[PDB]
Amino acid sequence: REWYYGNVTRHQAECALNERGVEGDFLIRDSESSPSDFSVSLKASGKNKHFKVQLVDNVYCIGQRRFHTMDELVEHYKKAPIFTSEHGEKLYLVRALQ
């Protein structure tokens, strides 16, 4: 309802995870500046993992890799910058707030 409005990260992401590293909150947003630009930030133990999503050569890249998906990887965190921690679990690409 109030998660994906068109732009929610970098500035809004903090406006939602202001807490500074709360739960596995991840949000991806389109970059009005570009036609195929997407950005998403996740929360961690006091840390904030931000990644850039750009469409390269008819491909959808996320962070520092290329995948066949762009803003759909947040639905099933497929080959997404998602990463697991010893007892922190996978940095899952979900959504903004509950």
Q: Which domain holds residue 90?
A: 1-98
Q: CB atoms < 10 A from the CB of 59, how many?
A: 12
Residue 68 forms beta bridges with which residues? 60
Could you give the residue ranges of the DSSP H alpha helices within the chain? 12-17, 73-76
CB-based contacts of 73: which residues, under 8 Å, 6+ apart?
60, 62, 67, 79, 80, 93
Q: CB atoms < 10 A from the CB of 92, how many?
A: 16
CATH number at residue 82: 3.30.505.10
Amino acid letter, 25? D
> How many domains does one find in the chain?
1
Cβ pair 40, 9 in contact under 8 A: yes
Cβ pair 89, 76 in contact under 8 A: no
- How long is the chain? 98
